[PDB]
């Protein structure tokens, strides 16, 4: 009875967590008992809340988890364990507090009181998203925020690449790695997207599908001469405006 369960979860511990298990291999793995008694101890082990019911698509599938985090969730009462189960089932991308309220039928107070107790027990952290901001996304402490950075100081590096070319795309990477650049990740896919910005300002030019020249706007940096045209603007009536015809 219980000794065969000690042999059952050894097989669940035998393989590293991936390559998820199912019965048609597990019956060939363990066939000392007939299926009239194989199912009974697994349903007893569902009552010992160590085996879970994973879904591989359209068909029947199992997964056995670690015991060290099984007693972690058995500390909770069944409602706190109910919200905990969905919030690890997302795992890699997080869950929204409206979606975690819909799938459980728990109304607005009883879910907001549930996770507030769960956060003190160090079992949920709160991150804000960038693909949709102003939305509360929760995760575990696995720290998987798969969702460069949206806040400014983009152009603080684009002045560096434009001073670099003005003297006259793979070479562009290694100039950025030096010179105390506050960076964390460079790739040619990014630097092309970093280069298309100054294509639109006409501060550099695209030639031969990868080469880049200066458009000589350095001489404008220093009729098409839009500085050194200072207006009168004071006590003058006959001045030309761009609006005020619409």
């Amino acid at each position: 009875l219980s000794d065969n369960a000690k042999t059952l979860h050894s097989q669940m511990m035998s393989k590293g967590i991936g390559a998820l298990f199912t019965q048609q291999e597990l019956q060939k793995q363990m066939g000392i008992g007939s299926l009239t008694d194989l199912m009974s101890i697994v349903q007893e082990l569902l009552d010992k809340n160590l085996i879970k019911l994973v879904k591989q698509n359209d068909e029947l599938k199992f997964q056995g988890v670690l015991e060290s985090e099984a007693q972690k969730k058995a500390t909770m009462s069944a409602e706190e364990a109910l919200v905990y189960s969905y919030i690890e089932a997302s795992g890699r991308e997080g869950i929204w507090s409206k979606t975690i309220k819909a799938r459980t039928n728990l109304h607005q107070h009883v879910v907001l009181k549930c996770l507030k107790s769960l956060e003190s027990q160090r079992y949920v952290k709160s991150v804000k998203s960038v693909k949709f901001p102003t939305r509360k996304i929760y995760m575990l402490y696995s720290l998987q925020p798969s969702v460069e950075l949206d806040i400014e100081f983009i152009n603080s590096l684009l002045t560096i690449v434009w001073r670099f070319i003005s003297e006259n795309t793979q070479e562009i990477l290694e100039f950025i790695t030096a010179a105390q650049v506050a960076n964390v990740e460079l790739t040619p896919s990014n630097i092309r997207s970093l280069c298309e910005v100054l294509v639109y300002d006409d501060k550099l030019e695209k030639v031969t599908h990868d080469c880049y020249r200066v458009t000589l706007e350095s001489i404008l940096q220093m009729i098409f001469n839009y500085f050194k045209m200072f207006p009168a603007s004071k006590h003058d009536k006959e001045v030309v405006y761009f609006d005020e015809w619409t």
């Binding site: 009239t36 199912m39 349903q43 009552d47 809340n49 029947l60 069944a78 720290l143 990740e185 790739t187």
Partner: protein, 178 residues
């Protein structure tokens, strides 16, 4: 109250439709059933000014507890922190109300408690240890060693956390190059 399954001869290893979700009321229902059933007469729920308020009635003090009090007030100066546990289900507030009480009725024994600044009749050595026999352990450093265990368990957690931080950095770089 976990998920249950069954062995159908037609569909083997099938999952049942009803235990998929829980009612959350049937376990509340049986809790209610062995409760007292009272027929309300409108004169029972009478309320006055002494209703929905603080406080209770303290048990009037005994001469047995006087010799546990004045000796605690002769050795210590006036230390209500440890007298509160000496009287196991009495509280910090009414022993302070007893302190102001005994000033007015017996104004001379609080002087004798103040005047005596010396070892008394040395019978309190058992009463020294009568407090010290409950859960005998060296609290001066036994509080330290399990607190050391508390930060030792935390020192596991960042190691379990920060190695879980670096597994994110290797996978999210791998699909970038892919």
């Amino acid at each position: 109250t976990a998920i249950q399954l069954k062995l159908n001869p037609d569909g083997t290893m099938a999952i049942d439709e009803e235990t998929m979700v829980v009612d959350r009321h049937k376990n509340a229902s049986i809790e209610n059933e062995y409760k007292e059933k009272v027929d309300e007469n409108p004169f029972a729920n009478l309320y006055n000014y002494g209703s929905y308020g603080r406080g209770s009635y303290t048990d009037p003090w005994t001469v047995e507890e006087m010799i546990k009090f004045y000796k605690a007030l002769s050795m210590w100066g006036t230390d209500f922190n440890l007298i509160s546990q000496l009287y196991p289900y009495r509280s910090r507030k009414q022993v302070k109300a007893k302190f102001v009480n005994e000033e007015k009725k017996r104004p001379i024994l609080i002087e004798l408690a103040l005047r005596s600044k010396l070892p008394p009749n040395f019978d309190e050595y058992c009463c020294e240890i009568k407090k010290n026999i409950g859960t005998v352990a060296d609290f001066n450093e036994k509080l330290i060693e399990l607190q050391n265990e508390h930060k030792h368990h935390m020192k596991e957690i960042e190691e379990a956390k920060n190695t879980a931080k670096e597994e994110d950095q290797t996978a999210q770089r791998l699909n970038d190059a892919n």
